[PDB]
A paper describes a structure:
The tumor suppressor p53 is inactivated by mutation in about half of all cancer cases. Most p53 cancer mutations are missense mutations clustering in the DNA-binding domain (DBD).
This highly destabilizing mutation creates an extended, druggable crevice on the surface. Building on this work, PMV Pharmaceuticals have developed a Y220C-reactivating molecule, PC14586 (rezatapopt), which is currently in clinical trials. The structure of the Y220C mutant in a new, hexagonal crystal form showed a slightly more open state of the mutation-induced surface crevice, due to shifts of the S7/S8 loop around Pro222 and Pro223, compared with the previously determined structure in a different crystal form. The Y163C and Y205C mutants in the L2/L3 loop region harboring the zinc-binding site were also significantly stabilized, with maximum ΔTm values of 5.6 and 9.4 °C, respectively.
Residue numbers in the entry: 97 to 114, 121 to 181, 185 to 291
The structure:
Amino acid sequence: VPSQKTYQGSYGFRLGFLSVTCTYSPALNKLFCQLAKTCPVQLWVDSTPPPGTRVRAMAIYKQSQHMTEVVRRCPHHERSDGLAPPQHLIRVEGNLRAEYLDDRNTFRHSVVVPCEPPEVGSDCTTIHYNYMCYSSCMGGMNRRPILTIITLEDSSGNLLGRDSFEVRVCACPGRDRRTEEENLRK
Ligand SMILES: [Cl-]
Ligand SMILES: [Mg+2]
Ligand SMILES: [Zn+2]
């Protein structure tokens, strides 16, 4: 099972977050988003990682009883940008250099882009992710919560930093965030 251990590493790596289409709960460390819509995830570092640094996104099941199962789309949502394979839950929007990878040992999917410097007008680098299947989809996540694990890696795949967040893909992310936050209070 892929580690979800937070690891700021030598570069001080950590994530930040911004009709609601995507909303992040700091209290829950949980992103709520609509199907296939833009999810801006910010990459923050204290110092600039070397040339060739890469950023990988991968989904895992949050519950220990499901951690060994590969997160994939349900059959219905398999059937596009002509780049993300139809089985991949997570895709990147707006990056000409996205790589879609299947682990040969674990069968897990991931998407990698080069680590780029912050865009003009921003103190951080933002990646736009899309989630291609609902949390509730029978045959896919089937109501099981997931984590997205973001790893900062060197050009050879070695770990430089790690952070993570829970995700719910749902039709009414603002309402679902409110319900889960109010339920946490009560
Ligand atoms: Cl659900
Ligand atoms: Mg955090
Ligand atoms: Zn689905």
